[PDB]
Amino acid sequence: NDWQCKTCSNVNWARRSECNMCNTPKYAK
RNA sequence: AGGUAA
Ligand SMILES: [Zn+2]
């Protein structure tokens, strides 16, 4: 369930609700 | 839990 950030392409651990690197929320699309 | 290698 890891997820890729639309904004910076970082692959975020499933448990994160915001990107680890750029802080963009998972729902921000 | 675990972060840059994904
Ligand atoms: Zn990001």
A12: phi > 0 → left, psi -120 to 50 → alpha, else beta; which? beta
Nearest one of A7, A3, A10 to A24, comparing CA atoms:
A7
Separation of alpha carbons A29 and A16, rounded Å: 16
Which experiment gave this structure? X-ray
Q: Which residues contact A28 (CB under 8 A, 6 or more apart)?
A: A6, A7
How far from the centroid of its chain's Cα atoms is residue A27's Cα? 9
Nearest one of A2, A19, A1 to A27, comparing CA atoms:
A19
CA of A14 to C1' of B5 (A): 18
Residue A19: Cβ-neighbour burial (10 angstroms; 0-12, 13-18, 19+): buried
Nominal resolution (angstroms): 1.4
Residue nearest to nucleotide B1 (CA to C1'): A15
Cβ atoms of A4 and A11 within 8 Å: the answer is yes
